[PDB]
Amino acid sequence: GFQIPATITERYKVGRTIGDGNFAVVKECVERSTAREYALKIIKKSKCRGKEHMIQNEVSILRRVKHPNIVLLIEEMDVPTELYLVMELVKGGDLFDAITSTNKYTERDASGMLYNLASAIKYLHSLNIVHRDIKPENLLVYEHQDGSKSLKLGDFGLATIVDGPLYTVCGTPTYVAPEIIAETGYGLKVDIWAAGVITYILLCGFPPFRGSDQEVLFDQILMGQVDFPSPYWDNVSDSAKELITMMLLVDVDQRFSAVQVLEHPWVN
Numbered sequence: 001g002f003q004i005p006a007t008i009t010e011r012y013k014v015g016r017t018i019g020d021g022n023f024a025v026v027k028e029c030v031e032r033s034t035a036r037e038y039a040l041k042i043i044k045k046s047k048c049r050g051k052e053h054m055i056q057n058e059v060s061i062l063r064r065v066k067h068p069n070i071v072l073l074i075e076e077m078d079v080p081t082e083l084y085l086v087m088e089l090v091k092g093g094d095l096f097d098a099i100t101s102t103n104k105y106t107e108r109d110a111s112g113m114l115y116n117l118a119s120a121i122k123y124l125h126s127l128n129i130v131h132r133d134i135k136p137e138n139l140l141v142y143e144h145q146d147g148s149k150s151l152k153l154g155d156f157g158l159a160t161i162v163d164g165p166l167y168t169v170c171g172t173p174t175y176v177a178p179e180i181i182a183e184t185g186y187g188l189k190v191d192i193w194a195a196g197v198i199t200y201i202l203l204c205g206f207p208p209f210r211g212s213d214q215e216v217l218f219d220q221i222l223m224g225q226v227d228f229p230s231p232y233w234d235n236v237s238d239s240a241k242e243l244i245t246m247m248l249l250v251d252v253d254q255r256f257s258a259v260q261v262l263e264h265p266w267v268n
């Protein structure tokens with residue numbers, strides 16, 4: 001039973017539900033004056049004891065970010081029980097569904113998607129922002145007039161600013177960087193690790209660390225042994241394998257920055 005604020009209903013016509021989850025509801029909505037379509041993300045704040053709700057972080061970060069490979073924030077409205085975000089609607093849906101539908105991608109296609117993602121990451125890191133939740137489900141597929149596709153990064157819910165090492169253990173096990181799991185302190189490059197895992201999935205359809213018991217999974221990540229198994233990876237270029245390898249280094253100082261990803265021949 002969402003209490004939609006007057007200011008939102010005044011300018012937008014709320015539409016159909018396009019997604020639903022444990023913390024947010026996302027709806028299609030239409031701006032009355034222009035008929036332009038947008039997404040309305042409704043974030044349910046956590047209720048505590050007494051008449052109060054927990055404060056949220058997403059908007060503090062979203063307010064700062066403006067980039068073509070990032071879902072644009074149009075407007076925000078905070079009420080005691082939930083938070084309202086009007087955001088650009090990306091009609092092609094998200095990358096999780098695309099991957100299940102398409103299975104795997106060509107190198108020309110995957111590199112273009114990685115080029116997109118690393119651009120977003122380079123930008124965020126230039127602002128000292130770590131996303132900490134980069135994975136296909138948080139990536140949206142923009143479909144161009146020319147038939148081409150581009151990625152847009154959304155959902156800044158776990159995002160924060162890096163000023164010295166961070167320690168909060170968070171994320172999705174498949175995509176989570178070893179230093180996060182090691183609890184020795186982490187920073188911006190956890191996003192590169194995530195991008196590496198995504199690129200790996202794009203070329204073969206399965207993740208590099210699949211585990212067995214969530215114990216085997218975490219050990220695999222900490223050890224970082226990246227394989228490119230036959231026959232799945234036989235027709236994939238050495239250039240692609242080299243780049244993914246550099247993104248998935250346990251040694252944080254050796255692991256590529258986003259700039260280094262964009263400068264690699266495979267993405268150019």
Ligand SMILES: COc1cc(N2CCC(N3CCN(C)CC3)CC2)ccc1Nc1ncc(Cl)c(Nc2ccccc2S(=O)(=O)C(C)C)n1
Nearest residue numbers: 018019026039087088089090091092093094137138154155
């Ligand atoms: C209309 O465009 C979209 C369609 C879908 N899918 C959702 C799943 C659905 N399938 C149908 C078939 N089923 C077999 C599986 C489900 C198809 C349409 C997903 C996302 C979008 N576009 C979109 N644009 C901006 C935002 Cl802002 C957002 N946000 C957004 C939308 C949905 C969920 C979460 C977020 S999110 O904002 O929390 C973030 C993860 C991007 N979603």
